C-alpha cells in the first residue's frame, strides 16, 4: 500500500463506507488523493473543475478552476468535442431561445383544464364531474380558501426552509443546463439562490420530502380531499392511541421505512429553470401550490396517441427535439402564479418553465378513482425502462407492494364484510367493487410474471395466499350479483 494512495482525509486507504461510493479526486497542486467525500466537494461539483485545488492548497493556489463554457447548447457545455453538435433540450442556449417563443404555445380547452376562483368553486365543479372517482381534468384554483390545504403564510421563504430543515440537509437537485441530478447542501443551494446576479449554472430542486420533519410536516399539508383519497394515507394513517393499537392488533401495521414518502415535497427553483416533459411516477396525481414565484406548465392529455408519442420520444436517442413539436398540437400552456394551486390527475404529460425565482409545496398520491390510468402509466414506465436505463429512485417507491397491502388490508376486508351479509356492493360501494376487479386483474398479471421468472419483501407464498383469498371473495360476491 503506497503512501501516495492514502487519502488526505481521513488519512486512510479505504473510506469507512451521502455515499462516498469508492471514488477519489486528486489535487492539481500537491498531487495528494482524496476520497470524494473527504475532498470538500459536494456531488454537484464533481464535473465542474478542470483544475481542482484541495483545501490545504487553496490558500496559496486560489479556488479550483472550472471548465470554460465552450458549448452552451450541449449538456456537456464544457466539452470542445460537442461544439458542432445540435442544440439539446434544454441546455442554456435552448432555454433562452424557448423563453422568447414560449408564449405562442396554445391555451387549453375547457375540457382539459378548469380554472376556478377558489376552493369552494373547486369543490362544486369537482362534484359535478363525478368527483375523485371520475377525476380526469386538471384544475387551477386561484385562491386556496376552501381547499382546507394547510400552507405557510406569505413572507415564508427559502430562508425559513433551510432553518427548519438544517443547513447540512442534502437534497437531490437538478443542474438545469446539464439536465442531471446531483446532491447539494441546502445551505449551498441557499447561497447560490441569494446571488441573483452571478449564476453560471441554474439549479432547481423538486425532491425535498419533509413528511418526516416534525416541524415542516405541520406547516404544509395536502388539501383535505387529497388526504381523504390518498391510498398511502389510507395504509399508513398518521394515527395515535387506540386507533394505532387496533392497527397493530389487526396486523394492518406497516413499517415506516416501507412507506412511500412522496406526499409532501418542497420545490425551489431559479428563474430560467426548465424541467422537461414527463409523467409523474406511478401515474400519481399531484397538488402543487405556488408560495412564491411563477410557473408555466406545458401539458398534454393522457390519451393513447399522446402516450405513443411520449413513449417514442423517451426511448429515442434524439435530444434536439422538443416533445411539443412532435405531439401534433397536444401540448397546452398554463401559467400558475403566486398563491395559485394546480391539481393534476393521473397520466398528464407535462414540462415546466420557471420564469421567476420560486418556492412551491406539492405532493404526489395514488387514489382508487384513477387506478386504471395509474396502471396504464406503470405499463408505460416499464416499457420505457426496457429500453433505457434509469435509477429506481425516479419511480414510484414500493408500487407493487403498496397494492398487495391495499388489497389485503383494505379491499379484501370490504368485500368480505359485504359478503358476510346481503349484500350487493353495487348498491353502496360500486366504486370499491369496480376498483377491486381492476386491481385484481392487474395483480394476476404480476403473479404470472413472477412465476415465470422468480421474484426480484413479500414472499411469493404470501402473495399466492392473498390472491386465493381475493378470488374466493370475488367469486362469492358475483354470485350474490348473478342472483339479484
Amino acid at each position: 500500500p503506497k503512501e501516495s494512495d492514502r487519502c488526505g482525509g481521513c488519512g486512510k486507504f479505504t473510506h469507512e463506507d451521502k455515499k462516498n461510493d469508492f471514488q477519489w479526486i486528486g489535487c492539481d497542486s500537491c498531487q495528494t488523493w482524496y476520497h470524494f467525500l473527504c475532498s470538500g466537494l459536494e456531488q454537484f461539483e464533481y464535473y465542474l473543475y478542470e483544475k481542482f485545488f484541495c483545501p490545504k492548497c487553496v490558500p496559496h493556489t486560489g479556488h479550483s478552476i472550472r471548465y470554460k463554457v465552450v458549448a452552451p447548447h450541449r449538456y456537456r457545455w464544457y466539452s470542445p468535442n460537442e461544439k458542432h453538435l445540435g442544440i439539446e433540450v434544454g441546455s442554456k442556449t435552448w432555454i433562452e431561445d424557448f423563453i422568447t417563443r414560449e408564449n405562442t404555445v396554445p391555451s387549453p380547452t375547457d375540457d382539459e383544464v378548469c380554472i376556478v376562483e377558489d376552493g369552494y368553486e373547486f369543490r362544486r365543479e369537482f362534484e359535478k364531474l363525478g368527483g375523485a372517482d371520475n377525476w380526469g381534468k386538471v384544475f387551477m384554483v386561484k385562491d386556496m380558501d376552501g381547499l382546507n390545504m394547510t400552507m405557510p403564510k406569505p413572507g415564508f421563504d427559502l430562508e425559513d426552509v433551510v432553518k427548519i430543515m438544517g443547513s447540512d440537509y442534502e437534497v437531490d437537485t437538478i443542474d438545469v443546463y446539464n439536465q442531471s441530478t446531483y446532491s447539494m447542501k441546502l445551505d449551498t443551494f441557499r447561497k447560490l439562490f441569494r446571488d441573483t446576479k452571478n449564476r453560471p449554472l441554474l439549479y432547481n430542486f423538486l425532491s425535498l420530502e419533509f413528511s418526516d420533519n416534525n416541524e415542516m410536516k405541520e406547516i404544509a399539508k395536502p388539501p383535505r380531499f387529497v388526504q381523504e383519497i390518498s391510498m398511502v394515507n389510507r395504509l399508513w394513517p398518521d394515527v395515535s392511541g387506540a386507533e394505532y393499537i387496533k392497527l397493530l392488533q389487526r396486523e394492518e401495521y406497516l413499517p415506516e421505512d416501507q412507506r412511500p414518502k412522496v406526499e409532501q415535497f418542497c420545490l425551489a427553483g431559479m428563474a430560467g429553470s426548465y424541467t422537461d416533459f414527463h409523467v409523474d411516477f406511478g401515474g400519481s396525481s399531484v397538488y402543487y401550490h405556488i408560495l412564491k414565484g411563477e410557473k408555466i406548465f406545458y401539458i398534454a392529455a393522457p390519451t393513447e396517441q399522446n402516450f405513443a408519442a411520449y413513449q417514442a420520444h423517451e426511448t429515442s436517442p434524439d435530444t434536439t427535439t422538443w416533445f411539443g413539436d412532435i405531439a401534433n398540437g397536444a401540448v397546452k400552456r398554463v401559467v400558475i402564479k403566486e398563491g395559485q394551486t394546480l391539481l393534476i390527475p393521473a397520466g398528464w404529460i407535462h414540462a415546466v418553465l420557471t420564469p421567476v425565482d420560486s418556492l412551491v409545496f406539492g405532493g404526489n398520491f395514488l387514489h382508487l378513482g384513477n387506478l386504471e390510468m395509474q396502471m396504464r402509466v406503470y405499463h408505460l414506465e416499464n416499457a420505457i425502462r426496457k429500453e433505457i436505463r434509469s435509477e429506481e429512485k425516479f419511480y414510484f417507491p414500493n408500487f407493487e407492494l403498496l397494492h398487495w397491502m391495499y388489497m389485503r388490508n383494505v379491499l379484501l376486508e370490504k368485500i368480505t364484510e359485504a359478503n358476510q351479509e346481503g349484500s350487493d356492493m353495487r348498491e353502496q360501494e360500486k366504486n370499491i367493487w369496480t376498483a377491486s376487479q381492476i386491481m385484481k386483474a392487474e395483480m394476476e398479471r404480476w403473479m404470472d410474471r413472477e412465476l415465470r421468472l422468480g421474484p426480484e419483501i413479500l414472499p411469493t407464498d404470501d402473495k399466492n395466499k392473498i390472491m386465493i383469498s381475493v378470488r374466493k371473495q370475488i367469486e362469492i360476491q358475483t354470485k350474490i350479483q348473478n342472483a339479484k
Partner: peptide
C-alpha cells in the same frame, strides 16, 4: 478534474 474509483 482527475478522478478514480476502486
Amino acid at each position: 478534474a482527475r478522478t478514480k474509483q476502486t
